[PDB]
Structure 1
Amino acid sequence: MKVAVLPGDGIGPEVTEAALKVLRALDEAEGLGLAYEVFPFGGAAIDAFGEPFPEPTRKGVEEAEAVLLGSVGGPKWGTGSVRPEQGLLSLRKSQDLFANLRPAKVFPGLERLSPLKEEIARGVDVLIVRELTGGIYFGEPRGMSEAEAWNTERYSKPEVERVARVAFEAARKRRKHVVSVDKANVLEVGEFWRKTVEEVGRGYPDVALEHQYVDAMAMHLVRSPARFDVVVTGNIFGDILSDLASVLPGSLGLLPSASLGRGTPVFEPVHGSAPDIAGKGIANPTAAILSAAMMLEHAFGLVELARKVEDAVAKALLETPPPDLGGSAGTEAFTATVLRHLA
C-alpha cells in the first residue's frame, strides 16, 4: 500500500495527519503493508520550490499506488502567475484522471442538517461519477463575436466508454445500480451517450442499468434522492448534478472526492484550506478520513475496511460532533473516538 501524501496548505497538514492516524491503526490491525511518504504540494511548494507541483512530488505520485491530498490555496498566492491551483490541474493531467467521483451521504442521526425533510433525507447515499475531460467545456469549435457566441458539446465513443466503466466497477462495490443521465430525447449527443452506455453495460450482467434525462434527474435528487446508488453523466451535467447533490447532506465540510483514470488515483476532501484556522486544532477531519476510506475502496478494493471506517466516523459524528456541527470536539478529539470505534 504505497501512498503519496500531499498535505497542502492551511488545515491540510492537520486533517491529513488525522487520516494517517486512522490508516496506521488499520495497518496495525490488518497488516495492509502501508508505506507512505509526504511531499510538498500547493502554496507550500511554491514558497519552498517556486512551483506548486515540484519534480520530487511528480516522481513521488508516479511511483505511488494512490494519492491522499490535503487542501490547497490561500490569500498569500492570489497574485502572480504561479497559482497553487495549477498544481491540481497538473496533477490531474499528469495521471490522465478522466472521472470524478463525488459522494453525497446523509449519515443516520444527521438528517437534521439536510435542507430536505428528514423523511426524504434519510438513507441518502449517492455517488456521482462525472466525465472530466470532454464535453462542452473542451469542445470545438467554440468562439465569440459581436453578434454571437458558440460552444460545442462533443463526445467520441472512447470517452463515454471509459467513464461508463468506472461507474459500473464503482457500482459493483456498492448496491450494484447505475443510472446514466443524458438528454437523449432532444440531443444527438444524448442519444449517442445512451446507446454507448447500454452497449458497455452488456459486459456487466451483475449490475442494473437505468437511464434518466438530466431535467428529470434534477427533480429526483430533490424529491427522492434515497433511491439512487451510482449516477454517471457528462462533464457539464455532472458538474451541475454534483453540486446539487453536495447540498443534500447540509454540510460541505463532510464531503470527500476522488479522481480516477489511467494513472495514480487522487483522493481529497472537498472543503477549502481554511488558513485562519490552521494550527488551532479544531479543523474537522471528517472529509479527509472519508477520502482515506475512498482510497481503500477504489484504489485497493478493500471495500469492507472502507465501510468499517465510514461507520466509525458516522458514530463519531453523533458521539463527539466537531465545532462545525455545533459540537466542541477538536481535531485530535474527533479522531480519537473514530479510532475507538475502529477497534
Structure 2
Amino acid sequence: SSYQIAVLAGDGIGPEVMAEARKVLKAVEARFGLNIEYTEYDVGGIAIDNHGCPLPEATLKGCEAADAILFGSVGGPKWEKLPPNEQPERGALLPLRGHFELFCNLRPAKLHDGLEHMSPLRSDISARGFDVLCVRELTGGIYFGKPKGRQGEGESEEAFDTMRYSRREISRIARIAFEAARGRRKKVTSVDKANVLACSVLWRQVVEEVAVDFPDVELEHIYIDNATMQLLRRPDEFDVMLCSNLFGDILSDEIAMLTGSMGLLSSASMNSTGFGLFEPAGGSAPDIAGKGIANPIAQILSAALMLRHSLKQEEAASAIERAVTKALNSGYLTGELLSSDQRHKAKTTVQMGDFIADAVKAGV
C-alpha cells in the first residue's frame, strides 16, 4: 500500500548526499501522489562504532521489512586498519547480497553531452561518446563458491577459492541482459575467459542457449583481457556487457572511471521479485565529508533507479532523471565537474539538491 524504504546512509558523504536524495523524493511523493515511509538504520563504519559490527541484526531485520534499500556509502580511513575481511564495505555488502539473493547488478554508464572533456580518454575517443550498461552476476562464481579457506602450515600452507556456476544461475542473469539490450541498441557482449576456465566454457554455452529467445539481439563473446583493452579504443561500440561476478567487478569499475564523472553514476542490485539495493557507484569520499562540496547526483539517481525497478513507478523515476539533465545543462555543476579555472562557479551539495527538487516540483 504505503511503500517502506530502509535508509542505510553509512559513512563519509553518505548522510549529506542522502539528505538531498530524500529532499528530491519528497518532491516526487507530492507530484505523483506516492506514500513512502523511510526508516534509517546504521551500516558500515558507523555501525561498527555504534554496534560492534558492520551489519547489525536490527539493520538486517529492518531491510527484511522494507520494499527496497536506499544505500549511501561505507568505509573510510578509520576502519581501513582492520583486516580486509573485517572492513565495513565487504562486511555490509556481501551478506546483504547473499541474504536477499541479489543476483543482478546493473551499472549504467554514459558520457554526458558537454562533459566529454572530463573522461581520461584522448579527446578524439571521448568526443564519440559512449553509453554502456554492465550487467554483473552478483551471487555466484568465486565470491560465494565453496570450498573456500586455507590448510597446512609454513611453506606449504595454502589458500583456495572456488568459482562455481550452474546453468540456472547463468541463464537468469543472461535473460536480463538480453531483455535490456532490446530496449537499447540490441547488442549483448558477453565477457568470459573460456580459453582457461571451465566456468567460462559453461557461461558461453548457456548464453548461446538463451540467445535463441532473442533473435533480434546481436550476441558476441569477448575474453576479459581483450575487453579491458577494447574499452580504451572503441567504447562506443558496446551496448550491454554481460559479466560474471569477478569479471563484472573489474569491468564495471573500469567503465565508471572512463566517464571521468563518478559522481553521476548509480548502481542497482536486485532479486527476481524486484526488491533491491540502490547505491552510488563511487565511495565514501571521507576527505570532503561535512563540507557541502559532495555531488549528490549519484545518490539522487539511485533513488530514481529504486522507483523504477523496485517500486515500479516509471513516471516518477523518469521525472528525476530529467531534473538531473536540466541541472547538468543549466550549469548546475559541483566542483569536481569543472576545470579548476571554472572552480568558482561550483554549486554546493544543497544548491544541487534544491535545484533538482525544484525542477521536479515545477513539472519537468
Q: Where on the TM-score scale, by shorter chain, does this alignment land: which range?
A: 0.7 to 0.9
Whether the 8 Å CA contact 1:107–1:314 is kept in 2: the answer is no
Counterparts in 2 of 1:155 and 1:120: CA distance versus 1, 3 Å: same
Q: 2:172 aligns with which of 145, 159, 162?
A: 162
Write the distance in 1 (CA, Å) between the matches of 2:288 and 2:115. Answer: 24
Return the letter of the residue paired with 1:70.
G
Comparing 175-184 with 134-143, greater Cα deviation is found at 134-143
Query: Percent identity at matched positions?
Result: 54
Encode CA deviations 1:116-156: one digit per residue, 9 max, x unaligned: 24453343121111222333455567778858987654422
- Identify the residue that residue 334 of structure 2 maps to in structure 1: 322
Change (3 A) 1:205 1:292: farther
Aligned residue identity for 2:250: I
Match of 1:106 among 111, 114, 122: 111
Aligned to 1:238, what secondary structure does the other structure show? Answer: helix
Aligned length: 343
For the 8 Å contact 1:18–1:335, the answer to whether it is kept is yes
Name which of structure 1's ranges 57-66 and 305-314 shifts more when overlaid on structure 2. Answer: 305-314
Q: Is the 8 A contact 1:173 1:303 kept in 2?
A: no
Shift of 1:89: 2.4
Aligned to 1:291: 302
Question: Which of residues 124, 129, 137 in structure 2 aligns to 1:123?
Answer: 129
Is the 8 Å Cα contact of residues 104 and 255 (structure 1) preserved in structure 2?
yes
Q: 1:223 to 1:34 in 2, by over 3 A?
A: same
Q: Which residue of 2 aligns with 1:255?
A: 265
Aligned with 2:72: secondary structure?
strand
- Map 1:108-257; keep pairs closer than 5 Å: 108-121=113-126, 122-139=128-145, 146=155, 153-184=163-194, 187-204=197-214, 207-257=217-267
Tell me the residue number matched to 1:310: 321
Q: Corresponding residue for 2:5?
A: 3
Task: Tell me the amino acid that sits aligned with residue 11 of structure 1.
Answer: I
In structure 2, what is the equivalent of residue 15 of structure 1?
A: 17
**Residue in structure 2 matching 1:281, options 284, 292, 298:** 292
Cα pair distance change 1:23/1:325, threshold 3 Å:
same
Question: Aligned with 1:223: secondary structure?
Answer: coil
Distance in 1, matches of 2:80 and 2:229, equals: 38
Residue 272, structure 1, aligned to residue 283, structure 2:
yes
Unpaired runs of 5+ residues, structure 1, are none
SS at match of 1:130: strand
Code of the residue aligned with 1:42 in structure 2: it is G
* Structure 1 pair 50–173 and aligned structure 2 pair: CA distance change class (3 A): farther
Deviation at 1:187, TM superposition (A): 5.0
1:275-332 CA-to-partner distances (Å, cap 9, x unmatched) read 3433222211011112112212322344454344233223323412102223420011
Inter-partner Cα distance in structure 2 for 1:296 and 1:171: 21
- TM normalised by structure 2 equals 0.82
For the pair 1:88 / 2:97, whether they are aligned, the reply is: no
8 Å Cα contact 1:177/1:208 also seen in 2? yes
How far has the Cα of 1:267 moved from its partner? Answer: 0.8
Comparing 286-295 with 31-40, greater Cα deviation is found at 31-40
